[PDB]
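User:
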Amino acid sequence: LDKDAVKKMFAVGTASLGHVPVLDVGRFSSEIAEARLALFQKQVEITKKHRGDANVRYAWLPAKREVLSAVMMQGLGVAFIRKSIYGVGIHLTAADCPYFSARYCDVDENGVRYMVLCRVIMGNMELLRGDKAQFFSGGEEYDNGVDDIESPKNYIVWNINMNTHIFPEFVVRFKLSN
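Assistant: Predicted structure:
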């Protein structure tokens, strides 16, 4: 996608919160990001061959200014791992639902918030049954987890998959009211 489409995705997806000014949309562009994209695209090939369909989706990851620098070289295991009602992994918000996690993006010293748009290899999606103690796939037939099959709001990528199945691509800088 281009930066305008990402901006539009974020604007339509946060409309319910009122005035949400988008200050900037950026894309990670470096030798490490390229190598990390190549790694991700090989996992896409593998998951496609294994399941028939890689089922790559866009999803939103709440971030903060302080972790952006680190994210490409050392991975998502900086600090992005959360425990929810659905289990433990990386929790991302579906493409049309950034309103859901916008407030969970930490404000920096200037009032600015940061949300990352990621490509996620969801593969064969497991409908999650609400197990607090789940930290991996409920079975060999499933890859990553989702809360609702028809209208997804939350994806759970298991810890084992965090570096293979998520490519952080775009950073959206924004503000909210009080």
